[PDB]
DNA sequence: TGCATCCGTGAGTCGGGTAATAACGGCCTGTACGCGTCCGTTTCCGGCACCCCAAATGAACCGTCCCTGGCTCCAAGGTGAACTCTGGGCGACGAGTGTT
């Protein structure tokens, strides 16, 4: 499933589509620590992803 | 009346082919073959009596497969504002450190 299908807000889509994350399969493959590593990552994005 | 004297059957199994004599004219014919000629056949040149036969030459011609006309009623391009990062800009604070 793509991350857009999760019907989320501005920042998470922006910071994901620049770097080529297209699905939630790679997102569930990546752990919370491996996804929070990104510079200027929103804590609200962390909350919604968790 | 023996008695020698023939005399009549064996005896199994799956490389070829090796020769003589007096005979000689002359006539007949006979069946097969070789000549010259004539007639039925048959096969075409071009003719009709016409058989007409026909693809090609005028129509419509009407439905239909293309043009032009106007009309929408909407969903995409144009017009807003914010905001959550996104990024840079500002500022203060602290020990490892250039020096005699």
Asked if strand B contacts A2 at the CB level, meaning under 7 A, the answer is: no
Q: Which nucleotides of B are covered by protein (CB under 7 A)?
A: 83-87
Contact (Cβ atoms closer than 8 angstroms) between residue A22 and residue A2: yes
Rounded Cα–Cα distance for residues A50 and A34 (Å): 13
Asked if strand B contacts A50 at the CB level, meaning under 7 A, the answer is: no
Rounded Cα–Cα distance for residues A6 and A26 (Å): 14
Nucleotide nearest to A42 (CA to C1'): B85
Rounded Cα–Cα distance for residues A27 and A21 (Å): 8
Contact (Cβ atoms closer than 8 angstroms) between residue A34 and residue A16: no
């Amino acid at each position: 499933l793509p991350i857009d299908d999760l019907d989320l807000t501005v920042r998470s889509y922006n910071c994901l589509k620049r770097e080529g994350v297209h699905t939630v399969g790679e997102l569930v493959a990546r752990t919370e620590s491996d996804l929070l590593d990104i510079r200027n990552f929103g804590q609200k994005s962390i909350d919604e992803v968790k």
